[PDB]
Amino acid sequence: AQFDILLGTYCNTLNFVRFLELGLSVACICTKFPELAYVRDGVIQFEVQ
Amino acid sequence: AQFDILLGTYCNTLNFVRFLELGLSVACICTKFPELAYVRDGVIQFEVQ
């Protein structure tokens, strides 16, 4: 009465990372812009006295 | 008179150990299996992403 037995399957669950909860999120100012593919150039100006 | 005397017999008893009460029992997950001599090959499985 020889027989093979399966004793169980183990599968891990991935943990998802949100960017805001990282400490690196304080080094940038994120902002959404859907029409970014149409942008030729983008100008940002400074006036320092 | 000239008698001989026996001044007592000393006998010790054993100290029984159980495997679970040892701290080594934490490193295994014991399970009874009466039909173990009939097992030809047992397998475990993993699915890791």
Of B39, B46, B47, which has the smallest distance from its Cβ to A5's Cβ? B39
What kind of experiment solved this structure?
Answer: cryo-EM
State whether A4 and B40 contact (CB < 8 Å).
yes
A12 - beta bridge partners?
A: none
* Chain CA centroid to CA A9, Å: 30
Q: Rounded distance, CA B45 to CA A11, Å?
A: 9
The residue assigned the tokens 């320092």 is: A48
Tokens of B21: 């009460």
At how many Å resolution was this determined?
A: 3.7
Q: Rounded distance, CA A31 to CA B47, Å?
A: 38
- Reported residue count of chain A is 49
Count of CB atoms within 10 A of residue A39's CB?
8
